[PDB]
């Protein structure tokens, strides 16, 4: 049994499984819902004349990087594309809400098709689920690659949008002609994205095809559990967030100075942060600073939550902590 503030722990029960699924659907809807809503407000408050890195526009610069209303650079000519994208996301939200409600109270209480039905300790089930999600992720990566091939994204060195070699095995070694966090070539971005999409699809095929092996069942001491699985996912998320924050802070090819502002300086007081290196008005920060700092600190607390859930997954109980401090008064 769980209290109301910890109410979602009730979904941990395999007794009510499908409702659990509903929650996740709802989350994604909410996520994509925000993608609409935010943009709309941004499109309301976005002045065209001002530099795009002054007012609170985060998604608008992201679209600007992906073409979408940019010409010779520093060019805004149609705010209708942004509204179109936001509307698409917000409309998808309604579908996802419908599915969430179908599983929440209309669908079965417990999945126990049954092919979707799984258990917390069924490594083949999780293996095939993992394969399918990897296949979709790699598919999205290859879709981005196709977008590069056909539409082509903004480039600062060329000053305009443009469409498009695997030395990735050297980028991975961070050889001085590398340190991917400093990529400045569209071909590098496209080739690496092709590579990651291919590898993701290969891994998805493999995981659907092949069950978890004993050699890797040795190391996974406790992750075959709800808390363990959640913890590993959260840790992965935190890792990704750190990498994205560093990319946003440093990289300028992907994040152009036009819509994001100049690069950030990494500073450290008691805790790390990123400073503007831009002569913006006092009290204002470039969108790049907002993105990097909020992303980084969200990832940091994701790491803390990963530690919490992982500790709870192994043999540890936090409610014992005061009792210990009771004995050693």
């Amino acid at each position: 049994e769980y209290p109301w503030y910890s109410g979602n722990s009730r979904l941990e029960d395999p007794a009510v499984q499908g409702k659990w699924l509903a929650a996740h659907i709802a989350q994604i809807a909410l996520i994509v819902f925000w993608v609409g809503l935010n943009t709309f407000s941004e499109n309301q408050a976005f002045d065209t004349s001002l530099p795009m890195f002054d007012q609170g526009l985060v998604l608008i610069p992201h679209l600007a990087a992906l073409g979408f209303g940019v010409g010779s650079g520093g060019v805004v000519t149609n705010t209708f594309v942004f509204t179109q994208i936001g509307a698409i996301h917000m409309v998808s939200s309604f579908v996802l809400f419908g599915g969430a409600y179908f599983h929440a109270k209309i669908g079965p209480s417990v999945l126990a098709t049954d092919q979707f039905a799984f258990s917390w300790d069924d490594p083949k089930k999780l293996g095939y689920i993992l394969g399918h999600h990897l296949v979709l992720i790699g598919t999205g990566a290859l879709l981005f690659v196709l977008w590069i091939k056909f539409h082509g994204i903004y480039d600062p060195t060329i000053g305009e949008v443009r469409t498009v070699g695997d030395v990735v095995l050297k980028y991975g070694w961070f050889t001085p002609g590398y340190n991917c966090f400093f990529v400045d070539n569209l071909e590098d971005l496209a080739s690496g994205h092709l590579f990651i999409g291919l590898v993701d699809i290969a891994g998805g095929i493999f995981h659907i095809n092949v069950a978890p092996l004993p050699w890797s069942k040795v190391v996974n001491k406790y992750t075959y559990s709800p808390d363990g699985l959640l913890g590993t996912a959260i840790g992965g998320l935190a890792l990704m967030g750190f990498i994205s924050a560093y990319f946003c802070a440093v990289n300028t090819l992907v994040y152009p100075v036009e819509f994001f502002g100049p690069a950030l300086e990494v500073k450290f007081g008691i805790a790390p942060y990123f400073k503007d290196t831009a002569d913006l008005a006092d009290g204002f920060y470039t969108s790049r600073a907002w993105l990097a700092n909020i992303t980084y600190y969200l990832a940091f607390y994701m790491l803390q939550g990963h530690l919490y859930h992982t500790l709870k997954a192994m043999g540890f109980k936090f409610e014992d902590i005061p009792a210990v401090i009771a004995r050693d008064t």
């Binding site: 001491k221 990494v266 500073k267 007081g269 530690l307 500790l311 192994m314 043999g315 540890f316 050693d328």
Partner: protein, 349 residues
């Protein structure tokens, strides 16, 4: 531990770290955590210093302990001790932080993995790691492995100085250094015959040769200790207990800390002037000090000052802690001190 006579002693939380002296898994966990703390300090402090670096101010004037140490060993220093590119310091600190995270993960892993004792764990191969506070064979093998790691580290330093180069204040710029090898000159530095004084080494070639020698010695000793059980006389002399080994290690560390403290204040080659600052002078009032030999007016203290004084104190109090732990492990209980002002003799084993 010690537990004079009465076993199952109860420790307060202030002395609560003596509770796990008998739990091998927890012992491992504590020490992995400590090493994580050390490497985390290295990386995080590197970044903390990089944040406030001023190219205008000379390096030693500002309060640093890590930028001079990195700049000494290559790592983005131009001619005349100029910090040209400040990115390699960032890379070094970042690698240190990643290593710290790995170590801390291992620490929590062992603190929660299995039984407190490593004998009971049914891993059947972790039981290969359970040790005792009495058996000198296993501890000899452990000593051998750790010496192997130290020798491998000295070798890595030799290689990195041979290939990447290393700063040379006498040359005035980063430069590859030929690894010397002259056992005669090594021993002449051992005797401190008038030409060669160990704390006044002038050529990085001599330093490199000595490091090559140290690497060879450590690797050979590691092999020897892994293969060979301790001789009986070493069982006659040394007591076999955990606190005794802590005492031995503490004495060694105190000596090394004092040596490094004296090294910082005097040698100019291995501690270049442009990075750490001008040499200190040892003073002795009530307690030893290192005078800056420079006007602290509007310049604070050089980094060499801070390093030398901190490590003098670290060495001294490591010696005092060694005395405390050796006195306990030999059998002396300090409660008898309370009997000082009485007619009862203040003395036992």
């Amino acid at each position: 531990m010690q537990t004079y006579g009465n076993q199952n002693v109860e420790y307060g939380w202030w002395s609560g770290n003596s509770r796990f002296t008998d739990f091998s898994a927890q012992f491992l966990a504590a020490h992995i955590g400590q090493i994580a703390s050390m490497t985390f300090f290295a990386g995080s402090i590197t970044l903390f210093e990089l944040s406030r670096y001023n190219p205008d101010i000379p390096l030693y004037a500002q309060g640093f302990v890590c930028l001079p140490q990195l700049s000494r060993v290559g790592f983005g220093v131009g001619a005349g001790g100029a910090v040209v590119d400040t990115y390699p310091f960032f890379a070094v600190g970042m690698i240190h932080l990643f290593a710290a995270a790995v170590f801390g993960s291992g620490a929590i892993f062992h603190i929660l993995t299995g039984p407190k004792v490593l004998a009971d764990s049914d891993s059947a191969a972790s039981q290969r790691f359970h040790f005792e506070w009495d058996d000198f064979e296993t501890q000899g093998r452990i000593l051998g492995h750790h010496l192997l790691f130290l020798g491998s580290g000295a070798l890595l330093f030799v290689v990195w100085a041979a290939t990447h180069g290393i700063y040379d204040p006498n040359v005035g710029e980063v430069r590859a250094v030929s690894p010397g090898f002259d056992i005669v000159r090594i021993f002449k530095y051992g005797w401190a015959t008038p030409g060669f004084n160990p704390f006044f080494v002038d050529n990085l070639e001599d330093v490199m040769g000595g490091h090559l020698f140290i690497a060879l010695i450590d690797i050979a000793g590691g092999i020897y200790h892994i293969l060979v059980k301790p001789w009986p006389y070493t069982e006659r002399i040394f007591t076999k207990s955990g606190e005794a080994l802590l005492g031995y290690a503490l004495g060694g560390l105190g000596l090394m800390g004092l040596v490094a403290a004296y090294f910082c204040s005097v040698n100019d080659v291995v501690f270049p002037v442009e990075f750490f600052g001008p040499v200190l002078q040892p003073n002795l009032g009530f307690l030893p000090n290192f005078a800056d030999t420079l006007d602290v007016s509007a310049s604070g203290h050089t980094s060499r000052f801070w390093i030398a004084n901190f490590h003098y104190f670290w060495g001294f109090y490591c010696i005092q802690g060694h005395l405390f732990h050796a006195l306990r492990a030999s059998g002396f209980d300090f409660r008898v001190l309370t009997k000082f002002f009485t007619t009862e003799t203040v003395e036992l084993g």
